[PDB]
């Protein structure tokens, strides 16, 4: 029945803009702590982290005190935030939005002037990223909290505990919290001539790779497997060019997608991008060999002549190495029959050359199957 009287008498001789220090030239103590409720998302393209926090301020007051007697009971009280003086603890490394804190939750004022202010806030900070192990990577974000206008000589920012209290956290599905610690630093800035105090809270998250493996890694290896099969196809099937083109287009699509879904930092290159470019350049190199093999399969003595060294080579030396074994009226009738027989003899002699060119194309295809299968296997390892 006297809370209104207490409010009227307490909020009569009060100035909001003055520090609550009775003996001037004495720094005031502000206790700081933070609580995390939900890590909304970690944006990798724009390098922005979004969290929800409960900042906690507990500072003693040289005023705003009374006696529990007279006003029977009423040991504590709640007052609007705007009426009392508050410190302006701002977030330095902002990314987008406003520097100030949100919410207007009232402050619980104790018997001796101790004030507990716990306003909610949702922050969008800036976090550098390393993508050198993109499917399985660790990130080291950081939040920097410090007073803007006041300095060390007027503020004595301390900490409660060297840990963020995980008393209420809706767990993120894709990121796992592994560590969260805070530290206090004493720094001196430029364009200003006094020492300033700072408090940094640095998260430590880990990724769960289930979504980014069965969707990105397995198809990549499936397509990388299909490349080597070009050199086992026969040249007469007619489908030799389709396989290479399909593999190349699939690699193009996969590289495009992974490039789309990663940050554009040029400090380093991901270990997956190197492999993708490596497989891409070999896949391009395999279309060239196919064209230079299909041309040897369709050569005939009527248009091309075999040289004198492609006989000793590609037929005796290389096949051995690659384990390829090489498997009156009678006169008028006489000349008519003789011409028919001689035509057959020259047809089989020509057909002999028409299969030597077919065997050379088989050797060249085989000698590149082993070169590829080595570097393709060795390249991953």
């Amino acid at each position: 029945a006297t809370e209104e009287r207490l409010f009227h008498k307490l909020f009569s001789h009060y100035n909001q803009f003055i520090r609550p220090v009775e003996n001037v030239s004495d720094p005031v103590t502000v206790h700081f702590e933070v609580a995390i409720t939900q890590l909304a998302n970690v944006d990798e393209v724009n390098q922005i982290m979004e969290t929800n926090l409960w900042l906690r301020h507990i500072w003693n007051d040289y005023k705003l005190r009374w006696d529990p007697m007279e006003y029977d009971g009423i040991e504590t009280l709640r007052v609007p935030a705007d009426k009392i003086w508050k410190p302006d603890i701002v977030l330095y490394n902002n990314a987008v939005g406003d520097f100030q804190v949100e919410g207007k939750t009232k402050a619980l004022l104790k018997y001796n002037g101790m004030i507990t202010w716990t306003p909610p806030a949702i922050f969008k900070s800036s976090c550098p990223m390393d993508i050198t192990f993109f499917p399985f990577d660790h990130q080291n974000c950081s939040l920097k909290f410090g007073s803007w206008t006041y300095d060390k000589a007027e503020i004595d920012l301390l900490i409660i505990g060297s840990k963020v209290d995980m008393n209420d956290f809706w767990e993120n599905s894709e990121w796992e919290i592994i560590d969260a610690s805070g530290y206090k630093h004493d720094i001196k800035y430029n364009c200003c001539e006094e020492i300033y105090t700072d408090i940094t809270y640095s998260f430590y998250i880990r990724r769960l790779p289930m979504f980014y493996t069965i969707n990105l890694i397995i198809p990549c290896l499936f397509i990388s497997f299909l490349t080597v099969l070009v050199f086992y196809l026969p040249s007469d099937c007619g489908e030799k060019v389709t396989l290479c083109i399909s593999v190349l287009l699939s690699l193009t699509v996969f590289l495009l997608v992974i490039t789309e879904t990663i940050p554009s930092t040029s400090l380093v290159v991901p270990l997956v991008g190197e492999y993708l470019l490596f497989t891409m350049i070999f896949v391009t190199l395999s279309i060239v060999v196919t064209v230079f093999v299909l041309n040897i399969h369709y050569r005939t003595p009527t248009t091309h002549t075999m040289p004198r060294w492609v006989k000793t080579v590609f037929l005796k030396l290389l096949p051995q190495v690659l384990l390829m074994r090489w498997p009156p009226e009678l006169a008028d009738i006489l000349n008519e029959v003789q011409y028919i027989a001689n035509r057959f003899r020259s047809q089989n002699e020509t057909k002999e050359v028409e299969d030597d060119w077919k065997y050379v194309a088989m050797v060249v295809d085989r000698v590149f199957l082993w070169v590829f299968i080595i570097v393709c296997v060795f390249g991953t390892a």
């Binding site: 939900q38 028919i340 027989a341 057959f344």
Partner: protein
């Protein structure tokens, strides 16, 4: 309206009634706040961001002892319509909001009865944060909650309570995607930390699956049933690799669409999203076997030799297990003999060529059954 003006002026000015003090004239005087949520329309559920949007009318009723006139001295008014920002309020807000804000929607009038009751009823449109489970995606049943907590006070100051153990439909417009199953309500209190109290409403919903059965599911089955025809095309046709590659890319494109209606998590993957991977593996193995069959088909005695062990197993034992089976005159004499002898050698090689075209036919039939037994076993195992 001569009575209403004097009533309002006296009641809200002469006492100097301040709307910053919780009504209490005892040691504790826990002022209880009745709650009864009332749904109006289920707007949407977003399974990608796990956010659900509703349209509810929260109802709160308490008893303020500072608003009690006589109702006969004031010409019998018996009721009032004081606007919201003049009466003490308990500040009940949603405590699991998605965007981040907690504040309530538009402030309307609140009816004050003649014995001190209050019947505030503000409309609102919330955006809660649900946990979507995706394991039977076309036919799934979800469980979304709405947790209400006091933004200013707690126990030792108030005590929340319910009036009906369920949510009320009233003005409801049915949706075409989800159908309501039940709407239970429960009050959570921890009997070791006194400064805690809340009221939770469970939204249990179930999808209507005709849309994603007409789409998605049927085309997936249609394109999966085409994966076995590669083993029936003849090898000299020339489109073996055309058929078995275009199917794999079609399956790959269908998988990426499914991962677009599914949240990015690491806990659950749809049963439909696991069948596609199995079919992908089967199709890749089919591609490899087709390449091997193509290589076996195009063989000749002039480049390859048939090993004696190949002639036995294939062409004798395996095919029956698969139920399949198949002077002067001397010059004329010499010249004619050569022509006949040349024809004899050609016919002997054509028989060896026709052996390779039947070995490749037996192999393709062997893999037709093998790639059929493992398809049934995998499908049953899901």
């Amino acid at each position: 309206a001569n009575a209403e003006e004097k009533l309002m002026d006296d009641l809200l000015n002469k006492t100097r009634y301040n709307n910053l003090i919780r009504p209490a004239t005892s040691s504790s005087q826990l002022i209880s706040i009745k709650l009864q949520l009332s749904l109006a329309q289920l707007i949407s559920v977003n399974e990608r961001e796990q956010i659900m949007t509703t349209n509810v009318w929260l109802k709160q009723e308490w008893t303020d002892y500072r608003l009690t006139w006589n109702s006969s001295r004031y010409e019998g008014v018996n009721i009032l319509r004081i606007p919201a920002k003049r009466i003490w309020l308990p500040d009940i807000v949603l405590y699991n909001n998605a965007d981040g804000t907690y504040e309530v929607s538009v402030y309307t009038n609140l009816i004050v009865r003649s014995n001190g009751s209050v019947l505030w009823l503000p409309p609102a449109i919330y955006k809660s944060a649900c946990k979507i489970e995706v394991k039977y995606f076309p036919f799934d049943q979800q469980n979304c909650t709405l947790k209400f907590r006091s933004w200013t006070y707690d126990h030792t100051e108030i005590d929340m309570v319910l009036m009906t153990p369920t949510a009320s439909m009233d003005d409801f417009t049915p949706s075409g995607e989800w159908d309501i199953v039940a709407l239970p309500g429960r009050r959570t209190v921890n009997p070791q930390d006194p400064s805690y109290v809340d009221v939770t409403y469970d939204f249990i919903i179930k999808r209507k699956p005709l849309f994603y059965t007409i789409n998605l599911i049927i085309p997936c089955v249609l394109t999966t049933l085409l994966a076995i025809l590669v083993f029936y095309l003849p090898s000299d046709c020339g489109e073996k690799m055309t058929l078995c590659i275009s199917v794999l890319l079609a399956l790959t494109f269908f998988l990426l669409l499914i991962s677009k209606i599914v949240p990015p998590t690491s806990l659950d993957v749809p049963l439909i999203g696991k069948y596609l991977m199995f079919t992908m593996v089967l199709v890749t193995f089919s591609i490899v076997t087709s390449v091997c069959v193509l290589n076996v088909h195009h063989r000749s005695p002039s480049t390859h030799t048939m090993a004696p062990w190949v002639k036995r197993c294939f062409l004798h034992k395996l095919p029956t297990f698969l139920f399949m089976k198949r002077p002067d005159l001397a010059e004329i004499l010499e010249e004619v003999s050569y022509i006949a002898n040349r024809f004899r050698n050609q016919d002997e090689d054509q028989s060896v060529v026709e052996d390779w075209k039947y070995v490749a036919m037996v192999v393709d039939r062997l893999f037709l059954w093998v790639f059929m037994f493992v398809c049934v076993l995998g499908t049953v195992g899901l």
